[PDB]
Amino acid sequence: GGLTDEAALSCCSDADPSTKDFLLQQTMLRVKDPKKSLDFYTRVLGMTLIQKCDFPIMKFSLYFLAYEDKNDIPKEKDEKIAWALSRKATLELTHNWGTEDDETQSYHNGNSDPRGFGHIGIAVPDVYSACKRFEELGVKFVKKPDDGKMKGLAFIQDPDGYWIEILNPNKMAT
Amino acid sequence: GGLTDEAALSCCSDADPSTKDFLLQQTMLRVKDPKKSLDFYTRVLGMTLIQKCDFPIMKFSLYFLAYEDKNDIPKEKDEKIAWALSRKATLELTHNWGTEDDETQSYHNGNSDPRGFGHIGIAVPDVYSACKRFEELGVKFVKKPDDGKMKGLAFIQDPDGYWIEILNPNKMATLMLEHHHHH
Ligand SMILES: [Zn+2]
Ligand SMILES: [Zn+2]
């Protein structure tokens, strides 16, 4: 079972010029408590809040988190949103107002039935030093770097239980 | 409800120097049928297959898709994996072998109970021209750009039913920053 290398290539088309400036801008995750999510993504993971949007009638907010230098954020609001929403590799965290006050409410991480989405993943220079710091800050682990079959690869979870892979691309050939 | 701009900013901390080389490398989605997913992501959305990994004991494959020039892909296998897994903004599609032949099997897109993940999103130069092409390619739409509350933004679905936003960054101020009427 599983596709051959040749079968996978037989399915691939080269990029049409009509797509040439397309970019993979965002992954959207719903978050129960934006106070906990903002602290985790900024203080623990080192992302920057690059844009906040509020929809007061539909009762939700969007938080765009990215690995960007805060000094690169434009000061004028229309330029800032066009900059933020043209960054590659952002996270769009959706806060449905009031979930943080609902003891019975939680989101689903995709890793138990019914499955779909699995994880986001962060590339780091050193999985072990990254994970030592995560452990010092009280991050919950799904998989410590040396636990299980694949040594030197970790999974943490965010405040909603979403899985985050921590990988060092220079060690992955092994 | 919801945080004020000041309250949200106050919940943020400046990035620790130990994180300054971290990058958001991948989003992982499980796919029923890799042939349909590869045709969709390469041909319809214009991504490149940059790495394929097979795990014969665990019976799954990984496909890494990205907006990269195929001429940048190293030929040597270990250099190629290090290159592919150091790209920002990749999609990691996980094929659990045998799903493609199981008429009763489908993955969950996160947009009905139980919710969590919602979508990925593609920034394009022109949502209307992109969507006209998508219509010509028989893409299934969730939301056309001229329907619903958020005009100028589209949602399409991939072969597993995952939602993909189609957005133009230069149209998002009017969509997201303008004063909205109460009825
Ligand atoms: Zn979105
Ligand atoms: Zn992964």
Swiss-Prot record, chain A:
Organism annotation: Homo sapiens
Binding site for substrate: 26, 30, 96, 115, 119, 149-150
Resulting phenotype, residue 11 to A: No effect on NO-mediated modification. Impaired NO-mediated modification. Loss of NO-mediated modification
Effect caused by changing residue 12 to A: No effect on NO-mediated modification. Impaired NO-mediated modification. Loss of NO-mediated modification
Post-translational modification S-glutathionyl cysteine, affected residues: 131
Keyword presence, Phosphoprotein: yes
Cofactor note text: Binds 1 zinc ion per subunit. In the homodimer, two zinc ions are bound between subunits.
Task of the protein: Catalyzes the conversion of hemimercaptal, formed from methylglyoxal and glutathione, to S-lactoylglutathione. Involved in the regulation of TNF-induced transcriptional activity of NF-kappa-B. Required for normal osteoclastogenesis.
Protein name: Lactoylglutathione lyase
Zinc as UniProt keyword: yes
